[PDB]
Amino acid sequence: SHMKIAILSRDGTLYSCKRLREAAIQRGHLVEILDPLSCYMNINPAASSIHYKGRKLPHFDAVIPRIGTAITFYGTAALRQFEMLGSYPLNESVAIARARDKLRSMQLLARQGIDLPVTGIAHSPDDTSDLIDMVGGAPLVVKLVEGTQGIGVVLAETRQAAESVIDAFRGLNAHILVQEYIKEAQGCDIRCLVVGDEVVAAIERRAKEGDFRSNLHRGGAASVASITPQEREIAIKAARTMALDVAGVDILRANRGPLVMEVNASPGLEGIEKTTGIDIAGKMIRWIERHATT
Amino acid sequence: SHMKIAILSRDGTLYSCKRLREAAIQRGHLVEILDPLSCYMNINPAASSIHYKGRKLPHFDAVIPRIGTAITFYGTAALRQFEMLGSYPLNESVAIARARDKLRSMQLLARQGIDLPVTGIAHSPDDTSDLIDMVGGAPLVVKLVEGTQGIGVVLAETRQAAESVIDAFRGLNAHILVQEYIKEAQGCDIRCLVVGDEVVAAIERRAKEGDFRSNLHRGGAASVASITPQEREIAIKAARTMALDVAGVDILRANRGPLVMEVNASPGLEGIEKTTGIDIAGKMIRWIERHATT
Amino acid sequence: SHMKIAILSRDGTLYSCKRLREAAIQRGHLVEILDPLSCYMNINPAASSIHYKGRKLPHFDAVIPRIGTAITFYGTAALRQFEMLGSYPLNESVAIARARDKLRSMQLLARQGIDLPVTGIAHSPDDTSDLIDMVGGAPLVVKLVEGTQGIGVVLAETRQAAESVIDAFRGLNAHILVQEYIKEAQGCDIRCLVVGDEVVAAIERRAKEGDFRSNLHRGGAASVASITPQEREIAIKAARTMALDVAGVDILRANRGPLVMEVNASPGLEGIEKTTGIDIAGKMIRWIERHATT
Amino acid sequence: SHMKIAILSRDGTLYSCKRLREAAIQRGHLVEILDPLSCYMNINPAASSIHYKGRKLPHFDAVIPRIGTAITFYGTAALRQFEMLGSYPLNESVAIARARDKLRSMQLLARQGIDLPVTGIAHSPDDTSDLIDMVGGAPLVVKLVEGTQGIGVVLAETRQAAESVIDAFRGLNAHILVQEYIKEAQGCDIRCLVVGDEVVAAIERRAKEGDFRSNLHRGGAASVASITPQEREIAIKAARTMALDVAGVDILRANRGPLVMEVNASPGLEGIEKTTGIDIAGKMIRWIERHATT
Ligand SMILES: Nc1ncnc2c1ncn2[C@@H]1O[C@H](COP(=O)(O)OP(=O)(O)O)[C@@H](O)[C@H]1O
Ligand SMILES: Nc1ncnc2c1ncn2[C@@H]1O[C@H](COP(=O)(O)OP(=O)(O)O)[C@@H](O)[C@H]1O
Ligand SMILES: Nc1ncnc2c1ncn2[C@@H]1O[C@H](COP(=O)(O)OP(=O)(O)O)[C@@H](O)[C@H]1O
Ligand SMILES: Nc1ncnc2c1ncn2[C@@H]1O[C@H](COP(=O)(O)OP(=O)(O)O)[C@@H](O)[C@H]1O
Ligand SMILES: N[C@@H](CCC(=O)O)C(=O)O
Ligand SMILES: N[C@@H](CCC(=O)O)C(=O)O
Ligand SMILES: N[C@@H](CCC(=O)O)C(=O)O
Ligand SMILES: N[C@@H](CCC(=O)O)C(=O)O
């Protein structure tokens, strides 16, 4: 087999290490870890070599992009050139790009029939009351975003809280913002990791006592999870819908049923690997092996 | 005929006025001018009405997006919902979005065989000298960008100037940056306006005495233009390649031949209309008439 | 008399016009309106001439700074050099600088015994409940700030609203934030204009029906005002405390008495002049005449 | 003795550790390390207790501020309240604030007779050529700043390089910018640390081969230094001029003589302590002991 695999990321942390690791072990591939910001290239004379620290990169059979949530325009541009050069990517540029846009993504999932929590979109709404009644929620979650980031979620328990929050962010200096209703659940969401056509690993993220969130560490506490065949199907469908080869789908257990809340094109590996003991980084190299062409 | 056409833009300026104007005249259409930021809607239960100042919008047969270069994530999200609701757009969401990304666009044009000036892409290159020799240029233009904007172009006449400039912007607080070679020309570029499958109008933009630029007004001076059949074909091909129904293509007259430098999905109307005396806003309403379905 | 007065501001709008106007009329002074951003100078060899569009400025007997709320670091640097060159300023650099910092200013006023509304300061408080009980308010105003700007005020009517708002902004991407209690009043505040040791003019700013604010135009409606001798004294004391020669003091009429809410070192002239019919721009030139040394 | 000393900083890193360390050792003081962002307090009813994680802070005899270069408005506001409460600060709020403003500081040093390199100040100069000839330098250093930060320095060796750089940053999206001439020296500057009325420690910072800088690590390499009595006097005078109790003065060895280039109100301790083996953190606690009042 023996591939030259590149890993597009900004440094050596567990996930990037765990595949330098699993690609050198598994069918003895060669691996170079490249900062996308240090690539530079002629986007003109179509294709052309990619340059890195004064030398020309040597042609990778595959590229594993792991692009930051703040470097996504240049990151995917570099990714694109590798694709143009022949490298197989897990998660392709177009799909990664789209994925960062939570709005376009939520829309896409919704159109494709995937059960989400009822969700409003807004920026400078002009009539907060009408916005709150739309969506329905007497208590709901407001999620600030700003461009393509996320900079806060907050629970609004009463009508007035939801009003004061929206009116606050309305001062466009916060820009785009999302409304969806809160849950039964209990600060607990299931995170599935999809690689290709299967859910490779899954954990429960539980919130702390003080309010909810649940986030990785906003007071988070991980534990191994018991996914229903229904939840497994959905998390795969979300990834398929998104055109992601590797993805983190987050699911909320509502009375009505499982609801997708978020999809990630660069899920972290540490918490989910350490929690379950599963070789995820290996299932990704294995996926590359089944699809890249040497 | 009689359509309800919406115009997605942030205010009443010549271009937005000139089509409220041309749609009310031409086959007596009804027009509402909407700020995208004031739309708010359920992106979930697939489709769902768009809300605006407390009321529900009434279904537009067509939407004319004219989205700002700084509102492009929410703008195209709102655009998308109109599309999902049945409205025909001139310039669709996906195509508009992509267009803002100058990097993805330059790449796309290049791949599709369109003659551009030789162009390097870079962010934090690590070896400026190698970057400068790549691209070739002893004198070249450095174009700062930052995310998806543009915040400066500058001519670097010597090797050292090109060095000092790159090293300056390299401090990532400027982020993504473009290198391409300077011209014969003479601070003068041809701007074509494409509507559908034809170039509807064209002007020459001439720079002032002090250095170049040429920009609309960075010292700009407009005058009617004599486009060659070759230049006309290209400006149409660029728009086709970009999937833009309406576009501003800017062309540089180089010795080698015409070179596309830029493509815009919301070209201004004033300078080009006043200069030529052509009813552009009408050719766009006319285009809508040939393609929207009532 | 005949002075050379410079006006440090970024353009010709009512206030800047109304003193080019009043300085050319009143004792026939000469006036140049300079953009601070276009000044450039040697801050070293102590003093040294200030340069502007390739020429050296000619020595102004006085400088009227009218520096933007976003240009205040360079603005006051240029201001400083004029001071170093001999020019008398109304509002000096140090005082202007300090004034932009609403936190340092509120603190200073408070220390100097000036009645303010009870006010909490916070950034990432860690225990919102304790913050809300401090300050007291069951209903209070949260005022987002971010560095030195202001980007929103909002009323929180219930405990929960005040909670959700603080928790929202707590995501430091909003940075520094202010809590103070809401009023009787009724979206109405008195704005005094101080020039030297007297209140030169005063208006009432009344809010619209929908909630409060009251702002110039956040639904604002101006009308001539009846200031009590007590309110007049305070607005003068605030300016004195702040070391401002010209200032806009905003006062809230509370049961307890008049409360300073805000102090401005570049108050607008239009609304207050048109409302009252008073020649404010002239009272400022007159002040310059009494204090600048030719 | 036994003082309660607070350390205002955002975390445990060498310098903050090395004084928790030296204050618990030296005359057995009690130390609490507080994040300024987590303080919250009533700036009104003059003074009032400072709150931290739901509890009231207990009165510190002294406060050691170590405020970030990006938190300086809120940081110094919290600092100010400690001062208002009786705590002795090394480096007081006003002096710290001013210090962040490199422009006001360079100006102040210059006015007070301290030899600096010849330095131009500019933002959007309008005539770069005149700016370059002012300052004199055929080769000079351009230092981007933006508000109050620093985001780049660069050497411009030729006239054209200096032109292209200024014209680049001129696009105000870089904001305020500094010109000063380059050196003999050789990417090497002397860094003195002043505590009170003496230079407590000093190192040489040497640049790498590729161009200059010299920065801590922009390729930096530290080594113990041999300060002349002249250089020692200056570094003390700079700190005195700046009203800093603790300061990092950086000096360039020019033919003409020693030139101050920079003054810091929160110098790092690690590089300078490890290089020289001097107990700096102790000389600061000792200073506090001589001046704080229990
Ligand atoms: N609609 C909702 N209902 C209930 N809890 C939610 C909802 N949205 C988010 N949360 C909680 O808040 C946390 C933050 O959500 P968010 O930032 O959108 O996603 P992520 O967990 O991927 O960062 C989630 O882990 C979840 O437990
Ligand atoms: N590669 C180039 N060679 C010569 N001149 C150029 C080049 N790129 C840009 N210019 C000049 O600088 C101006 C600014 O270009 P740019 O900002 O990229 O496009 P736009 O004109 O669409 O804003 C152009 O009008 C053009 O005349
Ligand atoms: N503590 C308060 N109590 C009642 N109303 C307030 C309070 N603070 C502000 N407001 C109202 O909100 C408006 C916005 O206040 P702010 O932005 O702080 O000052 P400014 O009016 O100078 O912009 C004010 O005009 C005022 O009428
Ligand atoms: N005027 C100058 N002449 C020569 N070298 C300089 C000059 N200014 C700065 N340098 C070099 O560049 C480095 C960066 O300078 P700067 O960022 O201003 O200060 P600091 O070293 O405090 O960060 C300095 O250490 C110095 O060696
Ligand atoms: N969200 C869109 C798709 C977005 C895209 O294709 O990029 C939809 O409803 O299909
Ligand atoms: N620039 C890409 C296309 C980008 C896209 O499809 O969005 C190419 O070379 O085809
Ligand atoms: N706010 C400070 C004064 C601020 C200053 O002097 O700059 C005080 O209580 O005196
Ligand atoms: N730079 C000023 C002093 C600045 C200040 O006092 O804050 C001077 O020349 O004195």
Q: Where are the domains of chain B?
A: 1-116, 117-183, 184-294
Residue D203 φ then ψ, to 5°: -130, 160
* Bridge partners, B225 (sequence order): none
Sheet holding A88-89, edge to edge: A30-34, A4-8, A62-65, A88-89
Distance from residue D104's CA to the centre of ligand 8 (Å): 6
Q: Alpha helices of chain C — where are they, by DSSP H?
A: 14-25, 72-85, 93-100, 102-111, 128-133, 159-170, 229-241, 270-276, 280-291
Give Cβ neighbours of residue A167 (< 8 Å, ≥ 6 apart): A128, C154, C155, C211
Cα-based angle C107, C113, C116 (whole degrees, multiple of 5): 60
For A83, the token pair is 């694709």
Q: Does B51 sit within 8 Å of A130, measured CB to CB? A: yes
Separation in Å, CA C77 to CA B179, C65, D106, D153 = 35, 11, 10, 20
Contact A50, B121 (CB under 8 A): no
- Give the method of determination: X-ray
Asked if A151's CB is within 8 angstroms of C171's CB, the reply is: yes
Burial classification of residue C182, based on how many CB atoms lie within 10 Å of its CB (0-12 exposed, 13-18 middle, 19 or more buried): middle
Tell me the nearest-neighbour CA distance from D149 into chain B, angstroms: 11
Nearest to D153 by CA among D115, D207, D200, D104: D207
Nearest atom in ligand 7 to D97's CA: 7
D255 is in an annotated binding site: no
Classify D86 as helix, strand or coil.
coil
State how far the Cα of D170 lies from the Cα of B154, in Å rounded to an integer: 10
Pairing label, strands D62-65, D88-89: parallel
C-alpha C137/C-alpha D152 separation (Å) is 46
Beta carbons of A163 and C162 less than 8 Å apart: no
User: Is A167 in Cβ contact with C156 (below 8 Å)?
Assistant: no
Does the CA dihedral A11-A12-A15-A16 come out positive or negative? positive
CA distance C278 to D44: 34
The amino acid sitting at D162 is A
- Ramachandran class of B278: left when φ > 0, alpha when ψ lies in -120 to 50, beta otherwise: beta
- Asked whether the CA dihedral C21, C26, C29, C34 is positive or negative, the reply is negative
Q: Across the interface, do A164 and C156 touch by the CB < 8 Å criterion?
A: yes
Nearest one of B189, C85, B219 to D126, comparing CA atoms: B219
Among all chains, which residue has been given the structure tokens 């949530």?
A69
**CA atoms in the 13 A half-sphere facing the CB of B95:** 21
Alpha helix positions (H), chain D:
14-25, 72-85, 93-100, 102-111, 128-133, 159-170, 229-241, 270-276, 280-291
Other C-beta atoms within 10 Å of D73: how many? 23
Q: Give the residue numbers in D contacting B (CB under 8 Å), as ranges.
A: 142, 144, 146, 151-152, 154-158, 160-165, 167-171, 173-174, 211
Q: Tell me the CA–centroid distance for residue A119 and ligand 1, in Å.
A: 13
d(CA A147, CA C143): 23
Q: What is the DSSP letter of D279?
A: -
- Tell me the C-alpha distance between B75 and B69, whole Å: 10
Torsion of CA B269, B273, B279, B285, to 10 degrees: -10
Side-chain-facing half-sphere of D230: CA atoms under 13 Å = 11
Q: Give the binding-site residues of ligand 4, using a 6 Å CB cut-off.
A: D 117, 141, 143, 150, 153, 180, 182-183, 185, 187, 189, 205, 212-215, 250, 252, 261-262
C85 backbone φψ class: left, alpha, beta (φ>0; ψ -120 to 50): alpha
Residue D292's nearest CA partner among D23, D56, D55, D45 is: D23
Give the closest residue to C118 by CA, choosing from C129, C133, C128. Answer: C133
Nearest ligand, CA D110: 8
Asked if residue D184 belongs to a known ligand binding site, the reply is no
Distance A43 CA to ligand 6 centre (A): 11
Tokens for A52, please give them: 């890195």
B44 and A148 within 8 Å at the Cβ level: the answer is: no
Closest ligand to C220 CA? 3
Using DSSP's 3-state secondary structure scheme, residue D46 falls into: coil
**Measured distance CA(C93)–CA(C109) in Å, rounded:** 19
Contact criterion met (CB < 8 Å) for D126 and C52: yes
The size of the C-D interface in CB pairs under 8 A is 158
C-alpha dist (Å) from residue C129 to C137, C161, C167, C174, D51: 11, 11, 10, 19, 12
Residue D161 in contact with residue D129, Cβ under 8 Å? no
The answer on whether A115 is annotated among ligand-binding residues is: no
Other beta carbons less than 10 A from residue D223's beta carbon: 11
Are the Cβ atoms of B44 and A119 closer than 8 angstroms? Answer: yes
Q: Identify which of A156, A170, A174 has the shortest CB distance to residue C164.
A: A156
Chain C interface residues (partner A, CB cutoff 8 A): 142, 144, 146, 151-152, 154-158, 160-165, 167-171, 173-174, 211
Q: Which stretches of chain B are assigned E, i.e. beta strand?
A: 4-8, 30-34, 39-42, 50-52, 55-56, 62-65, 88-89, 119-122, 140-144, 152-156, 177-181, 188-195, 198-206, 221-224, 246-254, 257-264
**Residue B10 Cα to ligand 3 middle (Å):** 28
Distances (CA, A) of D233 to D76, D90, D247, D267: 29, 21, 14, 19
CATH class of A1-116: alpha beta
For chain A, the three-class secondary structure string (H helix, E strand, C coil) is CCCEEEEECCCCCHHHHHHHHHHHHHHHCEEEEECHHHEEEECCCCCCCEEECCEECCCCCEEEECCCCCCHHHHHHHHHHHHHHCCEECCCHHHHHHHHCHHHHHHHHHHCCCCCCCEEEECCCCCHHHHHHCCCCCCEEEEECCCCCCCEEEEECCHHHHHHHHHHHHCHHHCCEEEEECCCCCCEEEEEEEECCEEEEEEEEECCCCCCCCCCCCCCEEEECCCCHHHHHHHHHHHHHCCCCEEEEEEEEECCEEEEEEEECCCCCHHHHHHHCCCHHHHHHHHHHHHCCC
User: Do chains B and A have 3 or more beta-carbon pairs under 8 angstroms?
Assistant: yes
Residue A86, phi then psi, degrees to nearest 5: 120, -15
Measure in Å the smallest separation between the Cα of C163 and chain A Cα atoms: 8
For domain C117-183, say whether CATH 3.20.20.120 is its number: no
Q: Which helix (H) or strand (E) holds C178?
A: strand C177-181
d(CA A237, CA B234) in angstroms, rounded, equals 41
The span from the CA of C290 to the CA of B38, in Å, is: 51
Minimal Cβ distance to D103: which of C77, C116, C119: C77
> Could you give the CA distance from residue D108 to residue D180 in angstroms, rounded to a whole number?
16
Which of A40, A119, A129 is opposite residue B131, by nearest beta carbon? A40
Identify the nearest ligand to the CA of D111 by its number: 8
Nearest-by-Cβ selection for D161 from B146, B160, B174: B160
The CA distance from A279 to the nearest CA of chain B, in Å, is 34
Neighbours of chain D (3+ CB pairs under 8 A): B, C
Cα of B25 to nearest chain A Cα, Å? 31
Contacts of residue C209, defined as CB under 8 A and 6 or more positions apart, other chains included, come to none
CB B220 within 8 A of CB B207: yes
Closest CA relative to residue C24, chosen from C16, C262, C130 = C16
Residue type, A37: L
Q: Report the distance separating Cα D40 and Cα D78, nearest Å.
A: 8
- Which is nearest to D239 in space by CA: D194, D272, D191? D194
> CB–CB of D262/D38 below 8 Å?
no
- Residue A246's nearest CA partner among A191, A194, A192 is A194
DSSP category for residue C266: S
Nearest to A122 among B40, B124, B127 (CB): B40
Element (H, E) at B275: helix B270-276
Instruction: Report residues whose beta carbon is within 6 angstroms of any ligand 7 atom.
Output: C 98, 104, 107-108, 111; D 80, 84, 94
Q: Which CATH architecture has domain C184-294?
A: 2-Layer Sandwich (3.30)
CB C253, CB C106: distance < 8 Å: no
**Residue in D closest to B155 by C-alpha:** D164
